[PDB]
Assembly symmetry: D2
Homo-oligomer: 209 residues x 4
């Protein structure tokens, strides 16, 4: 059936990411923002089914913005919750991703240099957007996307970090740098390791729900 | 069924727009460039029907560029043939559009002042694109689009001018100014007048000929 | 000398716009966000003076993003403080703009119909951006810009509304609709009336206070 | 002095690239299109000097489009002529670039696979633009730019291919695929080898003229 998406539950409690991410932000980010992206996606898919059947290409093009923005929001946030875990969990330990860290160290020199290069790209985003570590054929790359544009060009997304203001403003105010340093404590490196070992279809299996 | 578009024939012979536009360019623009947009549009639409049925959102988004580029190219060129006619034809006479030219004169002062602003936007396009005169809830307006992006935002397209290099290069070389000055001779004001009094759905009836 | 901008003070106290906009947001928006745009603008302008003197075209192009983002942020926010006033002030009364409201009513039918179209564009902005009412050679128009892109294309900006999340999130959370409905109470119609009768150079005199 | 650029002469004759590129196209591409980019660049730089002195930021932003478009056109075309040579020259032999081809073969598998991946990106450009082989920190990448956007983000440009319609239409008509296959005969691999061995400042030394 067309447009039958639903909001998946979190793999953890709303306060499980504290003190890195407050329980209020996790509640608003998931139950409000992410829910809205899922809802408007279903409506857009149902409206597109009408235009596609009638061969109304002007209406299909006019609907592309709503599908890209809302579909990407559901895609990016579905990835986001999976690659986040409480700091106490062993998944937050970079040692749980031995093959990923080896390629990371070969590319940027070390894990600390990659976190510096990753952090630099996140703080350099002008406006709303995301920062991603992706997998291209042979090596790795740091890429940024604006608003809710997803990584659907062929690359294998390893993990992403939301730099939208709704993700940190209630706790860090304008201090986005403090939000980046603290989010490294809640990065699920086990999820990042698995996605790095699978192909594109494997990473996009989180979309089942 | 989905993606069943075909190339519509021109309203005239390939040499009817000479000396403004050569017969070689008109044939290549129509039989080659426009045909490719029609063909690849059908392919993109058929692949999307699979993705929409399977609820494959990653595949649907990745196809948007192919649909917008090919669908817009088919739309813009389908408009293009309709709003062009030979200079000798009475449809190329601006007197065939009394309500449009009056509204133009109320907006820019006169038709020649409108031709000055329109030509400036066409020559100011950086790269591939189009120039259009549309009708909004405010009046008339000159808008430009990049590559093959169509005017599907709600405005009613009155007439457009293709500024792609494949539309003039074989005859005017890099002299796009000479291509703009001469294309004023073959502007179908009858089509522009008809579109100016109708709505979006009326103007977009030319797309049905492509089935 | 080049890059000598400073943050201009607000025309009121930080709590003068309550209850529409909280005092905490106004202080952060002004003393933190706007200050960063002013500071980083100066840095970008000083680096460009070196590149322009040395005729370093690669370095000049690479700096355009920093100049547009920081310069536009300083421009938009400088406009923002001027066209906002407390709801109790007589400047927030639409009767202080008889020529603007008459032109608005001729365009959208009434002021309330204009408020409906303006609010729709603000809530329809995907990501960070602004909404503006400008004055062209046609009349008035509602335009939106992304991130901190300013309205420097020729139009005369009448008034704008900041739709960045840092402008309302600490008080209205994700409820941007409530932020738009309440901001209508603090719109300085006196500033909008003054800008509506002047030209681009008159409206852009507020930037001189930043020296 | 501000805006004192001039059109550099070609390293070869107008018919030296035949039969790959006709003498008419080389004459129009260089003496007309490229000359226009240089001329409008100088004017834009002189107008910007006025705005920069008066601290007219709105005028500086409004001039960014003319500087990016015209400055990039002079930059891209200055690179283009240098990495082009007659087919008979030994510089058109890929064996004149042993270190570049070794990295090419390590990335895409072989030279023929890179030419296929490069050719695919060139024909996939929607509208006017360029295709480039660039050098990023450790490895190589195929990137495309629209219109006259230059590669000024930090990467080291190795060589580029113009996919603008003014570069091939007078000879290959709409057959851009035939234009891509034939341009491989006139690729100056010696120029590509040197740029790959130097840094960013070395590649942008061609701008001296
Ligand atoms: Mn988010
Ligand atoms: Mn065309
Ligand atoms: Mn703001
Ligand atoms: Mn070129």
């Amino acid at each position: 059936s067309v447009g039958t998406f639903s909001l998946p539950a979190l793999p953890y409690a709303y306060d499980a990411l504290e003190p890195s991410i407050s329980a209020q932000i996790m509640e608003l980010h998931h139950s409000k923002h992410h829910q809205t992206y899922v809802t408007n996606l279903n409506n857009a898919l149902k409206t597109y089914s009408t235009a596609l059947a009638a061969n109304d290409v002007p209406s299909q093009i006019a609907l592309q913005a709503a599908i890209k923005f809302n579909g990407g929001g559901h895609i990016n946030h579905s990835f986001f919750w999976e690659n986040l875990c409480p700091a106490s969990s062993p998944d937050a330990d970079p040692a749980s991703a031995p093959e990923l860290t080896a390629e990371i160290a070969k590319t940027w020199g070390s894990l600390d240099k990659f976190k510096e290069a990753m952090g630099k790209a996140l703080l350099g985003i002008q406006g709303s957007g995301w920062g991603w570590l992706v997998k291209e054929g042979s090596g790795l790359r740091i890429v940024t996307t604006k608003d809710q544009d997803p990584v659907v060009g062929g690359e294998v997304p390893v993990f992403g970090i939301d730099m939208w203001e709704h993700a940190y403003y209630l706790q860090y105010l304008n201090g986005k740098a403090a939000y980046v340093d603290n989010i490294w404590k809640v990065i699920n490196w086990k999820t990042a390791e698995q996605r790095f070992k699978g192909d594109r279809e494997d990473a996009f299996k989180i979309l089942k729900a």
